[PDB]
Motif scaffolding. Structure first.
Motif: not given
Lengths: 1253, 49, 189
Positions: A652, A666, C12-17, C133, C151, C153-155, C158, C160, C179
């Motif tokens: 982060r 990641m 570097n891939y963001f997201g689930h794997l 954008i 895009v 920015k924060g968290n 979830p 739940k 923007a």
């Protein structure tokens, strides 16, 4: 002349002409606060220069283009910079700061980053965000200095205007050239004059504590604030490190070419190794004579004990047979247009052919001149550059060699052709022999494991509490506490009463960032981890600790390389580049977790570890069968940790230097600040070097020479490594040095070993040793002066810095780093005088009332700055190996005490009352006038005080402390033993000390350790001001009880100890017959020769010296209760408040009542300490043999000590040795003269002070 | 050198970095072996010309 | 979809794997297909090189991802296959206040019964924010909506905070300039 008009008495006061007094000290300090930058720039115009400092400056520095073409926007709105020359070109440009600027409201010629651009960037404009990124990173580069810039060069001119001085031992004037000769002051003066120009204001920038103010000159570039730091660093080193003109001129040329380049810090990176490569890495290459130490290994090869068996000469055989350096260094100078400098360095290096003092001084002079800035870039550049690295494995583990899964772990097969089976064997046997120990199931060991990682430096639960809210668990937030939420202590108190299955998915959360700038390196990005992730990695640290302590045992500094650099013993330096990134799940972490999960299976079969219950996962480990197999605790922790190791880590990232940048991505890099980082890297380095030398080497060689070499080398006998790197000692055989071609073939085979499984060995082979960044040639220590700059301090955050009494704290560290390095004390300690006098007055700004602050000179001498003349004494009389504090103060006033008493009657302070120390004089009317007493107690006052304590309500405060006690102590036998020890201690031993070291301090200690970084604003700073004012306005009547207790004894020095080492041997750079005091003292006492990290470990009485609390305080409390009386149950209970099984505490208490304590350990009853200046030198033989009691004249009856209370002998050892070391010249045998009270009166007064500590 | 070339060819044919079955650097001292070359002619002299 | 999971680890891939594995033999499936790139033997060699390249991690079977994609919607079809789309549908996404040349981008769609959505409405959807954008290249689809970019920015959001009970779509596109700094909100009928 102009400076001389006000600093007439002071320049001659510190140069040994007249004595130093409080009068010229305070008048000079009034002058030291009264300045202006124009008053400083009259000075550098005033001094004429001798044209040997003069050299051309290219005009391309002052005219640099705009910065808009250097930055761009990524597809995720990330501000990153455009690289033109390589991907390492990610740093601050040197250009065009005058246009994005708005002037100050009353400083009409100084300015600031524009508020309009900041507001348009907080909107989210492209160009405004680019401009504020460049502006804030220019501010952050300009900020990295300790004090304001002109204050140092002012202290330089005040100290160094005295001219050449008189050496008392050598009886001659030194030929350190005058201030009119040096290049860097001339370049500093001319660059400041050309940057000012027609402006009346003359300074290039102004340093406020939060951020800098610039100057609105159209020729200003951002390369100027690091350049001026480098130039004042070379100007401050040339006066006091005895440089030549020429190497200083070459370093100034390289700084000018650095400013002329497209990026300053990028050039300083890419040319960080011109000066070592041409001089140190290419030294002597044909010799005929010299001397080198003859060290000899002491046979148990884990203990690291040494023996100096004399000096030995050299011959033509010991010339440098390392391979060539010419073509690579000439290409490196040719690529950037620095061919003249590399040709000059090589021409002067090829002259020397004899190993003596002057060649070593030349090497030190060449090493000192590399630029000493701190390389800085935006944190998005760090995270987007260094974390995208990834290892390439040319020979992976084949897919047939793994079995099926057990949970989420596969087992490496036995019939495996790969090299990983040796790693599997080593980590298996280490895990089994770790888990078979009964030490690992000690609840004190579990408690110290939990106390190990919850340190005050703990962060980043910043998405963990949100993820725990995202899995629906109820966490108390503890509303109403002055803690910050980011601390690991607060987080552990949140997670105190929760089962492991609820916080099981707390493991896969992210972590924020921590930045640290370094000398001439990429900025180190340290990182925390959260509480369950550091808890679950416990077998991973225990197994690596068992490797490093019992199985392979490389090492857990200087004399190792003094042995390994001795010319029949060559050495190979092994560096592993990107060692954090080069261990992943592909090879290492897979076979590591498989071997730990398989090795812990036997001896812990059903019992659980701390907090983590047993479980079950199904296995398919045999291809025919499928079943569910019960899983123990540590296996279950490996099961949970493996998910996180397989997934990779997300970071982060939040920088304050560029708005709009907020991202996570990641990565697969190993985390730097984990609980198992350095031990893990040492274990893997040792294991891979071992399996190299015993398998992979002999499988790929045909040469009997290389094979015969690799059979004899082993990691137990010849390989020492710390962290990632290490060196390898090659012993010298009977025929002399080993042939270099075979060593070269093995080296280029090590590189092929590394390129198989991911690593990239950086290997240098030049006939020198580097080890923990200490550079040794031919058994001679060389300090790197460029590693410790005087001007710059690391600042990572953009937050404002500390108040006044900490910038004055850092300068004793500056002086001590001057002590550890080799400097001409004649002008170095006098520079320390002018500087520490210049930092002494502050001008507080309290409302409507004018107050001034000043420390006296006696405070500065109490902290460790030894004097020049005291009260009519000989000039240049004291050494800087004096103790700090009361022992020091005692010793050097005792050396002068008769002459000082006779000076008392000069300007007569005469009193009838005859004291044993002074007699004719009184001391009150002298010392309270001179503020010696006020400066003594004012130095004793605590620096950097703060107390926020924002009104904690008792209920939630008690719940926080109780949850912290519940997390630290789970096992109630610890609670029972510490309440039992508390009750027995308040029964028996309480009353004499009223201050216990206990385990229940630690919940409170961590509670306020959370608020050790609250930095509240005004009220306690004003409280510090009021305490310093009342401690100044007082008038004491004596010293403390310790010093008045010391003043009764007397000594006598004579007969001049025999030399420990040879005088002709060059042992350390920067000490020689030119540097009289430190070299003469070194030859008198001899160097350390001991590992000195096991010496202090042998001293402390605790069974493993691990408590989480101040083991020095426990040993001090045990010794203080020993020497005063205090029946043995007091010591049993004092140990039980630290926590033992009630039996070994009782046994150790009965032990410590009776045995004789070592000399160094008995400092604890009297709070003495060996100074760190004595760490390079030997002390132990001087204590055992050269400060002895019962003098040569026989008994005097003020020499006897009873057989009871014989600890006074050991403290009188410290006393006589301090008296030896404070004197200049050699260390001298000292015998014990009269003490005027007897051992009776000394013991009674010592017990009287030890009544109240 | 001919034994060296055969060892390197054996290494390339077993596809290791080192031929396990080696022809050179053996335990047998064979410092008197001679394979034919272009130095000597049929009569018994040198071939510099 | 991609191959050789270190292609998703080195980059570097963001997201689930989700390492997955088919229940069939792949290597004979290689050489059956026609008109693929190059010879089929080269495709099989290249496949072996990807398989050697990847890792040693035990992947999974492929069934979990399709079970997640398909099987929750059948229970929702059994449950709310007869109520009204207006009161049993929902929609969440980014929302910018002002009006120049109201703005809303779909982020996730939700099917749920009436009580679940009337529980979903009062949750604190105003915590998360981003940068939005909007460009001006409208595409073949029928309503007036244009492609855009967002895009976060924060968290991150979830699951739940959606539910255990409602059934939402997993993956979607961003289709509505500069923007905007929008914040997301809930909408339904």
């Amino acid at each position: 002349s102009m400076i001389l008009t006000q600093f007439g008495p002071f320049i001659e006061s510190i140069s040994g002409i007249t004595d130093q007094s409080n009068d010229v000290f305070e008048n000079a300090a009034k002058a030291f606060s009264m300045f202006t930058r124009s008053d400083v720039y009259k000075a550098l115009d005033e001094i004429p220069f001798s044209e040997d400092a003069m050299l051309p400056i290219p005009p391309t520095i002052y005219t640099k283009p705009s910065h808009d073409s250097y930055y761009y926007i990524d597809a995720l709105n990330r501000v990153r910079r455009k690289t033109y020359q390589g991907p390492d070109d990610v740093y601050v440009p040197n250009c065009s700061i005058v246009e994005l600027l708005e002037p100050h409201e009353t400083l009409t010629s100084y300015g600031r980053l524009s508020e309009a651009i900041e507001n348009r960037a907080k909107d989210g404009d492209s160009q405004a965000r680019i401009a504020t990124t460049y502006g804030r990173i220019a501010e952050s580069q300009a900020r990295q200095i300790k004090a304001p810039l002109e204050k140092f060069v002012l202290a330089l001119l005040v100290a160094e205007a005295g001219g050449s001085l008189y050496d008392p031992v050598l009886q001659k004037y030194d030929e350190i050239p005058g201030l009119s000769h040096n290049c860097p002051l001339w370049c500093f003066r001319e660059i400041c004059r050309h940057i000012s120009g027609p402006l009346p204001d003359r300074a290039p920038y102004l340093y406020l504590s939060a951020g800098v103010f610039w100057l609105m000159s159209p020729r200003m570039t951002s390369a100027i604030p690091p350049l001026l730091s480098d130039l004042v660093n070379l100007a401050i080193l040339q006066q006091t490190a005895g440089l030549d003109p020429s190497l200083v001129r070459l370093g100034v040329q390289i700084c000018l070419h650095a400013a002329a380049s497209s990026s300053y810090a990028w050039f300083i990176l890419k040319t960080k190794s011109i000066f070592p490569q041409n001089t140190l890495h290419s030294m002597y290459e044909s010799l005929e004579g010299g001397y080198c130490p003859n060290l000899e290994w002491l046979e148990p090869r884990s203990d690291y004990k040494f023996m100096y068996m004399g000096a030995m000469p050299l011959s033509t055989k010991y010339a440098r047979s390392a391979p060539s350096n010419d073509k690579k260094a000439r290409e490196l100078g040719e690529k950037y247009g620095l061919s003249s400098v590399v040709s000059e360095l090589r021409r002067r290096t090829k002259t020397y052919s004899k190993h003596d003092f002057t060649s070593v001084r030349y090497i030190r002079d060449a090493m000192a001149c590399t630029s000493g800035i701190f390389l800085v870039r935006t944190p998005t550049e760090t995270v987007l550059q260094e974390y995208t690295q990834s290892p390439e494995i040319k020979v992976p583990i084949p897919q047939k060699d793994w079995t099926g899964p057990i949970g989420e772990i596969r087992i490496l097969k036995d019939t495996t052709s790969s090299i990983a089976r040796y790693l599997y064997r080593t980590w298996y046997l280490a895990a089994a022999r770790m888990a078979a120990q009964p030490r690992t199931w000690d609840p004190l060991f579990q408690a110290i494991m939990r106390s190990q990682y919850v340190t005050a430096r703990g962060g980043s639960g910043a998405t963990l509490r949100e993820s725990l809210y995202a899995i629906n668990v109820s966490l108390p937030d503890f509303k109403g506490l002055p803690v910050k939420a980011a601390t690991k202590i607060f987080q552990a108190a949140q997670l105190a009463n929760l089962p492991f299955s609820h916080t099981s998915v707390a493991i896969l959360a992210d972590t924020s960032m921590g930045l640290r700038n370094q000398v001439q390196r990429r900025p180190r990005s340290i990182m925390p981890l959260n509480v369950p992730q550091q808890q679950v990695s416990a077998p991973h640290t225990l197994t690596a600790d068992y490797i490093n302590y019992h199985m392979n045992l490389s090492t857990t500094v200087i004399p190792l390389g003094v042995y390994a650099s001795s010319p029949p013993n060559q050495s190979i330096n092994i560096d592993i580049s990107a060692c954090d990134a080069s261990i992943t799940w592909d090879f290492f972490l897979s076979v590591i977790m498989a071997a730990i999960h398989e090795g812990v299976a036997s001896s812990s079969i059903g019992k659980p570890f701390m907090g983590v219950p047993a479980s079950i996962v199904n296995d398919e480990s045999v291809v025919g069968v499928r079943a569910a197999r019960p899983i123990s605790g540590m296996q279950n922790m490996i099961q949970h940790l493996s998910k996180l190791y397989k997934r990779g880590f997300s970071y982060r990232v939040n920088d304050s230097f560029s708005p709009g940048n907020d991202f996570t991505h990641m990565t697969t890099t190993f985390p730097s600040g984990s609980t198992a980082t350095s031990t893990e890297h040492t274990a893997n380095n040792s294991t891979m070097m071992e399996t190299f030398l015993t398998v992979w080497g002999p499988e790929h060689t045909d040469d009997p020479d290389v094979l015969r070499l690799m059979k004899s080398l082993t990691i137990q006998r010849n390989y020492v490594c710390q962290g990632d790197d290490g060196l390898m000692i090659i012993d010298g055989n009977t025929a002399g040095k080993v042939n270099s071609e075979t060593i070269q073939k093995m080296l280029e085979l090590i590189s092929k070993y590394g390129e198989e499984f991911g690593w990239k060995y950086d290997i240098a082979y030049d006939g020198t040793a580097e080890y923990l960044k200490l550079y040794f040639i031919f058994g001679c220590r060389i300090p790197n002066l460029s590693r410790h700059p005087i001007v710059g301090k690391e600042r990572a955050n953009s937050s404002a810095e500390e108040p006044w009494p900490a910038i004055l704290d850092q300068i004793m560290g500056i002086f001590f780093n001057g002590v550890h390095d080799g400097l001409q004390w004649q002008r170095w300690i006098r520079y320390s005088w002018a500087l520490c006098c210049a930092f002494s007055r502050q001008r507080t700004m309290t409302g409507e009332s004018v107050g001034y602050l000043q420390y006296p000179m006696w405070s500065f001498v109490y902290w460790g700055l030894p004097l020049v003349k005291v009260f009519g004494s000989d000039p240049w009389i004291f050494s800087w190996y004096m103790p700090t504090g009361d022992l020091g103060m005692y010793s050097w006033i005792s050396l002068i005490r008769p002459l000082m008493t006779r000076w008392m009657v000069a300007n007569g302070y005469v009193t009838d009352k005859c004291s044993p120390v002074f007699g004719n004089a009184d001391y009150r009317k002298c010392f309270n006038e001179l503020k010696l007493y006020q400066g003594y107690y004012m130095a004793q006052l605590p620096r950097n005080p703060k107390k926020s304590g924002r009104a904690a309500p008792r209920e939630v405060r008690e719940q926080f402390t109780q949850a912290l006690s519940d997390y630290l102590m789970q096992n109630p036998e610890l609670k029972s033993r510490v309440l039992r020890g508390r009750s027995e201690w308040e029964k028996y031993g309480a009353g004499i000390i009223h201050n216990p070291p206990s385990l229940f301090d630690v919940p409170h200690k961590w509670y306020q350790g959370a608020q050790e970084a609250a930095t509240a604003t005004r009220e306690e700073l004003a409280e510090m001001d009021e305490t310093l004012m009342r401690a100044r306005k007082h008038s004491y009547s004596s010293f403390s009880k310790l010093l008045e207790a010391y003043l009764l004894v007397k000594w006598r020095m004579c007969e001049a100890r025999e030399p420990s080492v040879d005088l002709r041997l060059p042992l350390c750079a920067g000490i020689d017959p030119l540097n009289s005091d430190p070299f003469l003292k070194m030859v008198s006492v001899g160097p350390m020769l001991q590992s000195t990290r096991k010496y202090f470990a042998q001293t402390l009485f605790m069974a493993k010296t691990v408590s989480g609390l101040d083991v020095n305080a426990i040993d001090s409390a045990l010794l203080r209760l020993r020497t005063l009386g205090a029946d043995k149950k007091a010591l049993t209970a004092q140990l039980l408040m630290v926590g033992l099984q009630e039996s070994e505490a009782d046994a150790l208490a009965g032990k410590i009542m009776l045995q004789d304590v070592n000399t160094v350990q008995l400092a604890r009853v009297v709070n003495l300490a060996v100074p760190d200046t004595w760490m390079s030198l030997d002390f132990d033989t001087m204590f055992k043999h050269h400060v002895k009691l019962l003098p040569k004249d026989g008994r005097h009856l003020n020499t006897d000590i009873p057989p009871r209370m014989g600890w006074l002998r050991a403290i009188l050892r410290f006393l006589g040795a301090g008296m030896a070391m404070t004197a200049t010249g050699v260390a001298v045998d000292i015998y014990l003269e009269d003490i005027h009270g007897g051992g009776r009166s000394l013991g009674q007064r010592f017990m009287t002070w030890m009544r109240q500590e | 050198d001919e034994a060296d070339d055969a060892t390197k060819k054996q290494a390339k044919d077993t596809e290791k970095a080192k031929a396990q079955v080696t022809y050179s650097d053996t335990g047998i001292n064979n410092a008197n072996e001679l394979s034919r070359s272009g130095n000597v002619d049929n009569e018994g002299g040198s071939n510099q010309k | 979809f991609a191959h050789a999971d270190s292609e998703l680890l080195n980059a570097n891939y963001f997201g689930h794997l989700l390492r997955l594995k088919i229940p069939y033999i792949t290597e004979v499936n290689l050489m059956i297909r026609k008109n693929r790139e190059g010879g089929e033997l080269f495709q099989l060699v290249l496949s072996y090189l990807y398989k050697m390249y990847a890792t040693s991690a035990q992947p999974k079977w492929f069934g979990s991802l399709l079970r997640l994609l398909i099987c929750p919607w059948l229970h929702m079809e059994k449950l709310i296959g007869e109520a009204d789309p207006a009161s049993t549908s929902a929609e969440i996404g980014w929302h910018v206040p002002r009006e120049q040349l109201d703005g809303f981008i779909p982020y996730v769609s939700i099917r749920a019964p009436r009580l679940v959505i009337e529980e979903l409405m009062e949750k604190n959807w105003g915590q998360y924010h981003a940068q939005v954008i909007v460009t001006d290249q409208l595409v073949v689809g029928e309503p007036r909506r244009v492609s855009a970019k967002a895009v976060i920015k924060g968290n991150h959001l979830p699951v739940k905070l959606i539910s255990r009970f409602a059934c939402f779509t997993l993956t979607s596109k961003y289709e509505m300039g500069a923007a905007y700094n929008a914040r997301l909100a809930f909408r339904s009928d």
